[PDB]
């Protein structure tokens, strides 16, 4: 998401697009809603989507 | 559909929280880190 890797949760069901596309899922673009963004001592940014 | 399973030899697994750039997805990144 915008240059940052975020921890993504699912709305109780993975879309069938995942099963269809398999390991090639990176090809397609999805929509994400950022719950929160936080920091860590190592300077990393941990964001939940 | 077509072939659907691939190994880990040539698919970069980005760590969580790490900042990335578009180039990271290229085949060049795999050569560079190997």
């Amino acid at each position: 998401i915008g240059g940052f890797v975020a921890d993504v949760v699912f709305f109780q069901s993975p879309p069938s697009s995942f099963n269809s596309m398999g390991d090639f899922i990176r090809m397609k673009t999805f929509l994400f809603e950022i719950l929160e963004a936080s920091m860590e001592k190592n300077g990393s940014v941990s964001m939940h989507a | 559909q077509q072939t659907k399973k691939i190994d880990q030899s040539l698919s970069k697994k980005l760590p969580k929280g790490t900042i990335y750039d578009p180039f990271d997805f290229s085949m060049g990144r795999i050569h560079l880190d190997r």
Partner: peptide
């Protein structure tokens, strides 16, 4: 990212063909 991922896609299909061929041997 798309203009990179298309090239990555073609490269991966060609290489997986090559490695399947080698493994079959």
């Amino acid at each position: 990212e798309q203009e990179v991922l298309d090239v990555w896609e073609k490269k991966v299909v060609e290489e997986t063909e090559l490695m399947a061929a080698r493994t079959s041997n």
